Design a protein around this ligand. Sequence first.
Ligand SMILES: NNc1ccc(Cl)c(Cl)c1
Ligand SMILES: Nc1nc2ccccc2[nH]1
Length: 186
Amino acid sequence: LDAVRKRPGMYIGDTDDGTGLHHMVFEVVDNAIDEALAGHCKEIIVTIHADNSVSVQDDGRGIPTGIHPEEGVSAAEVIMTVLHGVGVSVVNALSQKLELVIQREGKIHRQIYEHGVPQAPLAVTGETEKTGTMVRFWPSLETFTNVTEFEYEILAKRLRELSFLNSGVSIRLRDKRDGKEDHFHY
Ligand SMILES: NNc1ccc(Cl)c(Cl)c1
Ligand SMILES: Nc1nc2ccccc2[nH]1
């Protein structure tokens, strides 16, 4: 990930005018949409949190959790930390904190990253009936300058375009700073 850290603008877009900041959300959403498509209920939820973080939840099958034979760590960690849209590893690299929650095969798995560094191995923390993947990220204020807060209408505009393109995927957008919400479903 150091190539990303070295030149984040080259991977995510402009880090001073809000372009890169919002693209961070869009990269995660792309992956959530892929996940949602391959599931039954096909809903994603994008939440803008009061502390200037964003979460994206899908109801898909959960991304794989088993050990990657070559890399020797969970497949989820390979996704989050190996360079492959630019990939969610870029998002993780430029997040001062990132929380991953995977619900799969009857189990909840959790893992925390800081600046793309895992704080511990992906771990089973409980049991569950549901499936899905949730990422919540705090963009690094060392990288993102000037425009450091998420603009609702920028997210809403893109999510609307996406709903037409991904028919039958339900997209919910929630702003916890002011109660604003939307529901895009074509
Ligand atoms: N929140 N959905 C989601 C789905 C797949 C991946 Cl790889 C990530 Cl990082 C997030
Ligand atoms: N604050 C801060 N910025 C970092 C960038 C890369 C790895 C660790 C880091 N801690």
